[PDB]
Design a protein around this nucleic acid. Structure first.
Lengths: 477, 478
DNA sequence: CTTATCTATGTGGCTTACGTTTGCCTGTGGCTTGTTGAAGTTCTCTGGTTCACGC
DNA sequence: AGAGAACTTCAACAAGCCACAGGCAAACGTAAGCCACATAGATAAG
DNA sequence: CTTATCTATGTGGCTTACGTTTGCCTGTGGCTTGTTGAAGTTCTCTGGTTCACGC
DNA sequence: GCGTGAA
DNA sequence: GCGTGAA
DNA sequence: AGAGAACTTCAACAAGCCACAGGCAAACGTAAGCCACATAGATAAG
């Protein structure tokens, strides 16, 4: 507890040793602040105090290959230990995950991501199961099924017949998971809505093309030296990158116009209207709020499904203060909103919104369908006073205040006492996100791991590293 | 001095914890064998055993920004410390410096790597001087000149008159260097000779084109996956990638034809001629021998180019076995060598190869000019700082030394200071000059590994600091 | 070649009783670099790569 | 929504040097009168 | 009531010498085992690119 | 067979 | 001017 | 030329298990004086 106050010159010698290390081994400066590195040096100063200053350091330091094999063996031991907990959790139906293919931009080997997302007391749990390849075989949906079955067999998972997943609209994904709960990634759907709505309004692509050409000129001509803000990727099939593109354009219009006048290429920008730009900034910022709200995975976000649709309707509500292109765009967007949402929504979505504590909005005829579905959804938890009919009207009667920082975590966790059995229904309902951000963040972790520097890695070791990092992020204080 | 050892179980928890550390922060496995890593371990165990095992790490460990600040300070500190050593080294002319531009992969900044190769006592030191980005300046000869003047100013060098330079034939590079020594990088000259000979022989395009398309479609369908050994780069301006890919195709030919027949792509391979491929393999690997000899810069090589000239002109010796393709290629090679590369040779090189202990090589009129060159040149070194140079010339030319391939002529000059001290000083001035500028390429390799995707927001000053300090540690620390 | 008891002398000695002698450590001041600690900013990117799908 | 990683920007503390004078605090000088045990001589039996 | 000394006794610690029995102490010289570890192969790369340059 | 778009 | 052309 | 980084192979070799021979100080029963204390008892006087 009471730690030592160092003599200052000792601290200078320490920093000199560390600095000569990092300079002579090209290491990043953040390695000095590693979570485990303070621990490891603690262990080494401990053993040095035990033994002194004249040990056989270079001999007693293990060889890297030994580290690899030890990591593999520890992976086996830890997965064996946690298989029991996995089975115990999965038996009670409270599970979720995301499944997605991955590919490396170095060796071009395709993979399949297997993970887990479930609920623990007053917290969300995400365990990365495993990431595996399919050799160069035709990555058909049955191959995906075989691989997932193998991975679940690795952790003694065999039933997997009542697990809930939020996925994309991939045809092989749809067919493979058609055997069980398949739910669409809402952010994917809303994005596709946005691009389809912009593609049915051609009067916007011309300003879009002009802005893209300006950004291309900015990038290739190597003149961002004056530019205070660097521009973004044009269109790498990325989410909302267009919004940031146009936002940076609205921010840097000044510098853009003076530098174009100085370069003699202002002729490619006179044909864009700035008021349209700012109005789209407001509207697309509203949907940016909607995406960021829906994209919450460290916290459930499925309770705001229909009211998000109402938000979209209000922000895109018809108005007369719009020029012909703006009004036509609003009509096209609301059309796409219709054609997508009342068709790819589910009664699961309605029940998820039904738990929303302001129960005055889902008062329509859908009460029949949610009560119809929940009745069949009420028996299974028991198969897996305070009568269901009375509890239904009691939970729909409650009036709950919306503080501006009100959250999905704690309200129901504290409301669990009045609700004895539907509470676990909610908890399973809360472990499922509104989108598939687990896959993308795991692929971020993978891409950080696998680099050009490490092309000769063994995929099994990659699985070990990924799962053990997940475990450490999960089961450490 | 006798190092105590711990129980095996102790090292077992040690390896367990090291595995934890590696897996937690995604660091490479090889980092555990860091040279400074062991220094860290020893220093930490010493400090722990000294002050007790209840130390306050949470401030003992400096912030990374403090690391950067300390490195930046130490860069100026150490360059200041060694500036006088630099001046002492360069004063006696026993040195050779090379520079070249560079560009990263993300921001595309201009650069100028400054490298210096000079001779120490029985070792040739290659010190990496500096690297300043050219920002967004137009790369005029004035900009290059001003940058080099500033770079030498940080070393307090403004003489920069007798020093020897090896570069390519870059037009702007030549223009900025139109006022002092310039030696053409022989590696680029040879590569250009080969490329220009091959382009002047369209009848050799069809085998090259066929192999290139084979590689491109092996990449395209990823059917290199069944191949155990892959193919090399298509055409990103790579040294002798053509050799490597064609010889790899020869080595993998059996599986290649098997897969092409299986996939129905054997209809496009019927146009290959493998005997010509084998002949090219033999001859171009012969060339790669000279390539690697030239690339060897840790050893003096300025006295091994004319014999390489003899070897190449022997390689193209006329014969009835050369097909019209081979005959045309060999004619192009000899013509290109004669009318470009033989022309672009230097009097410095002629004198440097004159020092070959079997001096029987240039018994021709090549000696007519050297006496003008040597006597005038070494009349200045005597002022820069009985065994007369005139009789010293015949002293050296009379002796003949056997060619024992196990010998090192390094020690031969390092010992010939006994009788020919001034001339051996001329040799060491000559032989501190590598024949190729690929040292700059190792520097660019180190730089490319320094700057990464995740280190974009890096200080160019800091990058120069790191490169210089690692170079100095390699040069001064074992 | 003792062996004992008295009968004057006579100086340590010592436990207080007390008065100096450093003296050290230690309270307050007053800077002086000197890190340095957030504190945002700004990018990299992860954010899609070859097939099930009805038609 | 992550995640790594480096970068200005304040601008905000803070350990680390002196200057030094004020105690209480350990230890050394006289003195000091009651002891009081140590130091020499007769003296009876012989 | 004591005070001294011889006189007739025991008589069991005791203390060395003798033999007898013992509860293990290294060493044994054969039996398993992670683990540097020396040789590899196999990379993905650097193999810098906009002013020169003049008839 | 046909996108195909959804990644 | 004009076109490689040295990497 | 050089990079920095994971695999792959025999491998042998220095840690731990094992546990029949050969060996040793420790413990016990015995026997020889033995011999130095220990006991009363008397014997004179006072």
């Amino acid at each position: 507890r009471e730690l030592k106050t160092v003599s200052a010159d000792c601290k200078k010698e320490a920093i000199e040793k560390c600095a000569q290390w990092v300079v002579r081994d090209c290491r990043p400066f953040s390695a000095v602040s590693g979570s485990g590195f303070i621990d490891m040096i603690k262990f080494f100063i401990k053993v040095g105090a035990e033994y002194g200053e004249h040990v056989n350091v270079e001999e007693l330091l293990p060889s890297p290959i030994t580290l690899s094999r030890k990591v593999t063996s520890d992976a086996k031991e830890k997965k064996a230990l946690i298989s029991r907990e996995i089975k115990s959790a999965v038996e009670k139906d409270g599970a979720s995950a995301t499944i997605d293919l991955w590919t490396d931009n170095y060796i071009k080997r395709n993979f399949l991501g297997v993970t887990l997302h479930y609920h623990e007391n007053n917290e969300l749990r995400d365990l990365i199961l495993g990431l595996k390849s399919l050799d160069f075989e035709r990555s058909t949906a049955e191959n995906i099924y075989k691989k997932l079955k193998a991975i679940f067999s690795q952790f003694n998972v065999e039933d997997l017949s009542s697990i809930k997943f939020v996925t994309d609209r991939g045809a092989n994904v749809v067919k493979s998971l058609a055997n069980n709960i398949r739910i669409n990634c809402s952010s994917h759907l809303l994005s596709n809505v946005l691009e389809n709505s912009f593609e049915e309004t051609p009067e916007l692509n011309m300003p879009i093309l002009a802005c893209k050409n300006i950004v291309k000129y900015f990038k290739k001509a190597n003149l961002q030296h004056r530019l205070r803000s660097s521009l973004k990727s044009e269109c790498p099939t990325r989410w909302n990158s267009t919004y940031t593109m146009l936002r940076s354009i609205l921010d840097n219009w000044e510098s853009v116009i003076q530098i174009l006048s100085e370069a003699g290429e202002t002729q490619r920008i006179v044909h864009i209207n700035k008021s349209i730009i700012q109005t789209m900034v407001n509207i697309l910022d509203g949907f940016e709020r909607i995406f960021k709200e829906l994209q919450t995975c460290s916290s459930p976000s499925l309770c705001f499904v229909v009211p998000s649709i109402l938000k979209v309707k209000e922000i895109c509500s018809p108005d007369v203060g719009d020029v012909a292109d703006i009004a036509k765009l609003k009509v096209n967007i609301i059309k796409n909103v219709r054609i997508i949402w009342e068709e790819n929504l589910s009664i699961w979505h309605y029940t998820a919104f039904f738990f929303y504590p302001p129960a005055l909005h889902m008062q329509q005829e859908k009460v029949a369908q949610i009560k119809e579905f929940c009745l069949s959804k009420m028996e299974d938890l028991e198969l897996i006073p305070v009568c269901p009919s009375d509890e239904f009207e009691f939970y729909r009667k409650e009036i709950v205040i919306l503080s501006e920082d009100f959250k999905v975590m704690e309200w129901w966790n504290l409301n669990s006492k009045k609700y004895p059995k539907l509470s676990k229904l909610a908890l399973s309902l809360l472990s499922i996100p509104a989108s598939s951000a687990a896959s993308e963040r795991t692929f971020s972790l993978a891409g950080n791991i696998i680099t050009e520097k490490r092309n000769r890695i063994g995929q099994q070791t990659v699985d070990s590293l990924l799962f053990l990092n997940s475990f450490y992020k999960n089961f450490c204080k």
